[PDB]
Design a protein around this nucleic acid. Structure first.
Ligand SMILES: [Mg+2]
Ligand SMILES: [Mg+2]
Ligand SMILES: [Mg+2]
Ligand SMILES: [Mg+2]
Ligand SMILES: [Mg+2]
Ligand SMILES: [Mg+2]
Ligand SMILES: [Mg+2]
Ligand SMILES: [Mg+2]
Ligand SMILES: [Mg+2]
Ligand SMILES: [Mg+2]
Ligand SMILES: [Mg+2]
Ligand SMILES: [Mg+2]
Ligand SMILES: [Mg+2]
Ligand SMILES: [Mg+2]
Ligand SMILES: [Mg+2]
Ligand SMILES: [Mg+2]
Ligand SMILES: [Mg+2]
Ligand SMILES: [Mg+2]
Ligand SMILES: [Mg+2]
Ligand SMILES: [Mg+2]
Ligand SMILES: [Mg+2]
Ligand SMILES: [Mg+2]
Ligand SMILES: [Mg+2]
Ligand SMILES: [Mg+2]
Ligand SMILES: [Mg+2]
Ligand SMILES: [Mg+2]
Lengths: 51, 234, 126, 186, 103, 142, 144
RNA sequence: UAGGAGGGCGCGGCGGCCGAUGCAAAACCCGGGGCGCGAGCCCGGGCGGAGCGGCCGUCGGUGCAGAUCUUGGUGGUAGUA
RNA sequence: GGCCGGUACCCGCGCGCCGAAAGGCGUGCCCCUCGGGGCACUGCGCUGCAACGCCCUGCGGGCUCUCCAUCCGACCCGUCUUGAAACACGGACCAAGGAGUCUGACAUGCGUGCGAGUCGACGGGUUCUGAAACCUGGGAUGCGCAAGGAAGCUGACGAGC
RNA sequence: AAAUUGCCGGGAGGGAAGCGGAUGGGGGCCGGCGAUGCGCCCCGGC
């Protein structure tokens, strides 16, 4: 009557995902990274086509 | 048997309870990612403004006939450069307090008269300087580990930060960066949270470790040139 | 008859840890004794001298005590002790004790045949 | 190299298990490992580690001292990881429910004849899985004879330590160092 | 001599190993005394095996004067008051003590 | 088991007449239990044929062809050694005997524990009976 | 039990645990309590103060029996009373305990007594012991 | 290093359990195969010809490279002086 | 370009179509307004990456075994010592023997039993492999239960923070 | 049994030899040294 919910979970260390150059790893860290890249990626289009 | 059904029903209750928790969590995860996305935009936004504002301020003074004295530096990155053999007991104790007890360990410091006078007494053993945005960000993502219940937990994700700090309204790695870089009200908590950085031996080498950076060696203050050394040990 | 082990057996050292200077004297036995001498350069671990056993050499706990057969051995003396390996046939291999006679060995081999038990000295004494 | 004392490893020692290979005490320990594990009763954590204790760290409790400690709280269960000994110097004992590892024969009769209960620790976990409505009691640890000899040396100022002496009488440890007429007074 | 211990006082400075008395013959002592008692019982049958009658005496010395025990023998007055002649008593199973007094 | 099974396991764990232990008390120790109501012949309290009131046995019969004996003890007859055991002789086909084992080990909640071990020991016992009669044909190394 | 002796664990170690520099020599401090006032003076003065000297006066031919006086407190007198007789009583009617039949000579006054009167009949008694017995309503009787 | 503790390995008895052996026990021999970080252990082949082993508990005259160590045997010196 | 790894979750797959396969294919809101972009509702289950080879009783495969070769490393152990490879001592070799034990007193720690008690240890009784085992005494034997005094002597009236 | 010795076969050597790590060449030895079975199926009998 007093025990807590039994816990059969075995959680382990998760393998490393490249935190700077792995798409699903950067985004799940910093969701705004996708936008921030695309802003200057978009600006680079304007800059190069300008000349 | 009663023991049979009695046992299955509680498991059904317990299993029922879990889905409600998980159903609640995806909703909280959806709210969080928008909150985290919102925070990161303004942090990215205001760094750009800070850089542009200094350029603006210096320009305004020059046309007036004066000149703008820049704000004095607030954050140091300190890296140990000397081994652990044959150490004086006072030098040994300070480096323990600075959380630098192995060569090429690095930590972040607040500038203080209390702090600067601790580095003056262990300066031959450490190199230090003023980190910038790129150095502070790449260190924390690539080599950042958390101190969860006295254990070194890699900051592979945002939940580690939420459970690590959380109370101080630090929820994501990007606000953990901001908290460190612009030394904030909880810099004490968010900087003790980070386990001492474990850096590579510098790719390309050092100069003579035995001398001060000013002499041409490597010890001491190398204010903005610490960023070049971060690139090569990170 | 097919072993369960699905992982290669790595040994960090195959050579033995012979005793220092047992190559120089005859009455010294080759079994390992740790030098306790004050000036012993083996004890002090100079380079170019004979090595001492450490816990660091210890083999992976998963593939420990597995024979090159990829079975772990259990020595039996009679058919009854053989029949204890009925349900472990893919992990344990029997081996007849060195002092089991030819008559008794024929029985163990016949019985081990049916239960599909790997036996590593099946041809001895015949 | 990393600057640490003994590699950062723990140098203190605590009993992680009892010393006796007593089968019933071993069974009790399995129960309370489960109880601390699933119920998180702080009471249960205390009971477990006290089960891992030597005879001198679990001193007996007299019924006189127990009766004093229970007075007015007779709607609760007294809990002692140890022995209850009978005390002849007491007359009034209330009806009280006591859990202990052992009762002496005279103690248990005195408690039962008052209309109380002499519970075991397995029975306690039935009637209090979280230690609710309990009075957790220890006995006097520093009451042993050996403890008198502990502390500052017998012959230093301000120490009242008992010396190891083979006999008592005037010829044993009284003259030089114990009075002003013979040298000095400690 | 070293750490806080009791002052050692063992009396082992003589040739004590020449006077060690071991007790390996204790079970045999019991058997010889049992056979001695049993053989004595037959040679005195039917007389009682405890021996002659012993009187009640108080013990000496403050510590024990409140305790009664068996004495050596009856006094002359005790024998004469009960009318058992002096020289007949040991012959019928009653010990005598010409030394004890009646105060 | 006139006393509880948890108690009995405490007494017979470190020493008993059925436990054959080899190669010392180091990390080389190998230990088996040769009691007949232990399905894997494993010295554990789960499989112990000594420290359980409810145990399952799967044995090839004595000299006879294709007869598997299945035995289950009786919880309330613990103190009557002779008539503690309920044994059944099955010479039916494998899939039909796989049903009988489930009926008496699993579906009645006797020892849902030993559902897998009992069937696996039936598989091994039954195959040893074919090979005894038919003789060795396969080598099974593939 | 030779198998658990620690010398069996130092086999193969040269000095058997007694050191290379300071050896296990025969009697490097002297035998027994040699040097109690010379080179063990700190130890004798620290742990055994009072050891040396002569105090008090001799008692030729001391007999212990002359000095025998067992003592019992009043707190223990009611365990001496059997329960049925502890029931037979009135307000003025009290049980009488001859402590001499229990091996005691003197009665001391430590501990409390219940309200029930008692008549302690002893060879010897202290001030407080009788003061506590009277205060319970009982009396004391002297005997020999 | 000096030193302390824990967990193991090994030798010989005793109380118990489980076993091998004239279809070849112990001991010894081997460029035989293996296991263990290691102490050690398991198996093969040979020799031998009648005893032996493992596990639990318990016990001890229980582990050698030294001591100008004890006893025995054996070299180089040397077919030399 | 190097090293490691090969998936029981993280990724990934099926649930619709096209496509050898990459991969593509839908709707609505916001954004510039090219490209196209961003967000959207999300569900059920499943869940060890592959393709070809070589050898197969061979002159094959590997080996922790033996010998030899070569490169690198490499002074003889034990001992006392601040310091030993020492021009410090002991050691020609091999086998067997060879050194912290037994006992008494005490102490701390730990285990067992009983507990204001606790010991049956000198005896007695009984016991048919047992010099064992088992019973018995103790109302005062030892230790503990009370201490301070040289002694004569006296001897704990009941705890608050 | 060992120390030590003879014979036969093999191997190497410019004022020591032995030793630790590597590997290459020779030997010598290893068949649990290394598999040929499992699922659909068609009969033809048990
Ligand atoms: Mg480079
Ligand atoms: Mg340099
Ligand atoms: Mg310097
Ligand atoms: Mg040295
Ligand atoms: Mg003073
Ligand atoms: Mg040492
Ligand atoms: Mg020592
Ligand atoms: Mg020495
Ligand atoms: Mg000394
Ligand atoms: Mg000295
Ligand atoms: Mg000394
Ligand atoms: Mg002097
Ligand atoms: Mg002997
Ligand atoms: Mg010896
Ligand atoms: Mg020798
Ligand atoms: Mg030595
Ligand atoms: Mg010198
Ligand atoms: Mg020299
Ligand atoms: Mg000398
Ligand atoms: Mg010499
Ligand atoms: Mg020897
Ligand atoms: Mg007594
Ligand atoms: Mg030879
Ligand atoms: Mg030749
Ligand atoms: Mg070499
Ligand atoms: Mg080679």
């Amino acid at each position: 009557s007093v025990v807590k919910p039994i816990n059969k979970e075995v959680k382990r260390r998760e393998a490393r995902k490249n935190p700077l150059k792995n798409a699903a790893a950067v985004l799940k860290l910093n969701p705004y990274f996708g936008t921030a890249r695309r802003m200057a990626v978009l600006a680079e289009a304007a800059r190069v086509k300008a000349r | 048997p009663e023991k049979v059904i009695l046992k299955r029903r509680r498991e059904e209750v317990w299993a029922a309870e879990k889905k409600q928790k998980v159903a609640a969590e995806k909703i909280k995860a959806a709210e969080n990612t928008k909150v985290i996305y919102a925070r990161a935009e303004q942090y990215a936004g205001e760094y750009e403004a800070q850089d542009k504002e200094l350029v603006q301020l210096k320009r305004e003074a020059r046309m007036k006939g004066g000149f703008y004295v820049s704000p004095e530096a607030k954050l140091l990155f300190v890296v140990r450069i000397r081994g652990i053999n044959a150490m004086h007991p006072k030098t040994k104790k300070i480096l323990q307090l600075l959380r630098l007890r192995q060569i090429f360990n690095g930590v972040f410091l607040k500038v203080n008269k209390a702090t600067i006078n601790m580095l003056r007494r262990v300066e031959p053993y450490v190199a230090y300087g003023y980190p910038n945005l790129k150095s502070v960000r790449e260190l924390i993502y690539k080599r950042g580990y958390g101190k969860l219940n006295k254990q070194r937990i890699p900051l592979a994700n945002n939940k580690v930060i939420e459970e690590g700090l959380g109370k101080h309204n630090i929820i994501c790695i990007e606000d953990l960066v901001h908290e460190i870089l612009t030394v904030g009200p909880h810099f004490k908590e968010a900087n003790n949270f980070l386990w001492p950085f474990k850096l590579k031996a510098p790719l390309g080498g050092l100069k003579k470790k035995r001398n001060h950076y000013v002499e041409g060696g490597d010890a001491g203050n190398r204010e903005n040139y610490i960023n070049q050394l971060v690139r090569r040990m990170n | 008859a097919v072993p369960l082990l699905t992982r290669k057996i790595v040994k960090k050292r195959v050579k033995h840890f012979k005793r220092a200077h047992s190559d120089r004297y005859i009455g010294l036995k080759q079994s390992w004794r740790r030098p306790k001498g004050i000036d012993s350069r083996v004890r002090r671990k100079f380079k170019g001298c004979t090595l001492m056993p450490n816990i660091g050499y210890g083999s992976d706990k998963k593939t420990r005590h597995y024979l090159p057969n990829k079975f772990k051995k259990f020595v039996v003396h009679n058919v009854s002790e053989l029949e204890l390996l009925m349900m472990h046939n893919r992990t344990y291999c029997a081996e007849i004790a060195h002092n089991v006679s030819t008559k008794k060995r024929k029985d163990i081999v016949e019985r081990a045949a049916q239960l599909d038990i790997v036996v590593t000295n099946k041809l001895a004494r015949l | 190299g990393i600057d640490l004392v003994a590699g950062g490893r723990n140098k203190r020692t605590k009993r992680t298990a009892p010393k006796s290979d007593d089968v019933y005490l071993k069974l009790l320990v399995k129960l309370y490992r489960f109880l601390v594990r699933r119920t998180k009763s702080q009471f249960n954590a205390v009971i477990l580690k006290r089960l891992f204790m030597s005879k001198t760290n679990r001193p007996p409790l007299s019924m006189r001292r127990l009766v004093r400690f229970m007075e007015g709280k007779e709607d609760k269960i007294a809990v002692i990881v140890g022995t209850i000994t009978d005390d002849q110097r007491v007359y009034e004992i209330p009806a009280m429910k006591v859990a202990a590892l052992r009762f002496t024969e005279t103690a248990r009769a005195r408690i039962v004849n008052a209309g109380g209960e002499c519970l075991t620790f397995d029975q306690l976990a039935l009637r209090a899985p979280l230690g609710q409505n309990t009075l957790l009691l220890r006995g006097p640890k520093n009451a042993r004879e050996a403890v008198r000899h502990f502390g500052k040396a017998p012959g230093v100022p301000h120490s009242h330590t008992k010396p190891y002496v083979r006999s008592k009488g005037r010829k044993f440890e009284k003259a030089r160092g114990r009075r002003n007429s013979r040298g000095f007074k400690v | 001599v070293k750490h806080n211990n009791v002052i050692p006082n063992g009396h082992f400075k003589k040739h004590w190993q020449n006077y060690v008395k071991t007790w390996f013959n204790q079970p045999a002592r019991k058997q010889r005394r049992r056979i001695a008692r049993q053989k004595k019982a037959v040679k005195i049958f039917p007389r009682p095996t405890s021996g002659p009658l012993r009187p009640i005496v108080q013990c000496q010395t403050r510590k024990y004067n409140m305790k009664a025990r068996a004495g050596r023998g009856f006094t002359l007055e005790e024998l004469k008051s009960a009318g058992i002649p002096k020289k007949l008593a040991p012959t019928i199973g009653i010990s005598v003590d010409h030394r004890r007094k009646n105060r | 088991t006139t006393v509880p099974g948890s108690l009995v396991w405490e007494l017979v764990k470190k020493n008993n007449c059925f436990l054959i232990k080899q190669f010392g008390n180091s990390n080389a120790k190998v230990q088996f239990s040769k009691e007949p109501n232990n399905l894997y012949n494993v010295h554990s309290y789960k499989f112990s044929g000594l420290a359980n009131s409810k145990t399952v046995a799967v044995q090839p019969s004595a000299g006879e062809d294709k007869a598997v004996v299945l035995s289950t003890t009786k919880t309330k007859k613990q103190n009557t050694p002779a008539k503690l055991q309920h044994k059944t002789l099955m010479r039916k086909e494998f899939r039909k005997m796989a049903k009988s084992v489930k009926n008496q080990v699993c579906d009645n909640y006797y020892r849902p524990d030993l559902t897998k071990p009992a069937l696996a020991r039936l598989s091994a016992v039954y195959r040893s009976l074919q090979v005894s009669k038919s003789g060795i044909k396969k080598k099974n190394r593939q | 039990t030779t198998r658990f002796k620690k010398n069996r664990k130092k086999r193969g170690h040269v000095s058997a645990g007694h050191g290379r520099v300071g050896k296990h020599r025969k009697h490097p401090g002297g035998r027994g309590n040699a040097g109690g006032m010379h080179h063990h003076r700190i130890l004798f003065d620290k742990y055994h103060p009072g050891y040396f000297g002569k105090v008090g006066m001799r008692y030729f031919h001391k007999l212990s029996n002359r000095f025998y006086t067992p003592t019992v407190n009043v707190e223990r007198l009611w365990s001496m009373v059997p329960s049925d007789k502890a029931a037979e009583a009135g307000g003025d009617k009290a049980p009488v305990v001859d402590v001499s039949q229990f091996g005691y000579f003197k009665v001391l006054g430590k501990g409390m007594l219940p309200e029930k009167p008692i008549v302690v009949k002893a060879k010897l008694i202290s001030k407080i012991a009788e003061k506590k017995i009277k205060a319970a309503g009982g009396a004391v009787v002297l005997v020999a």
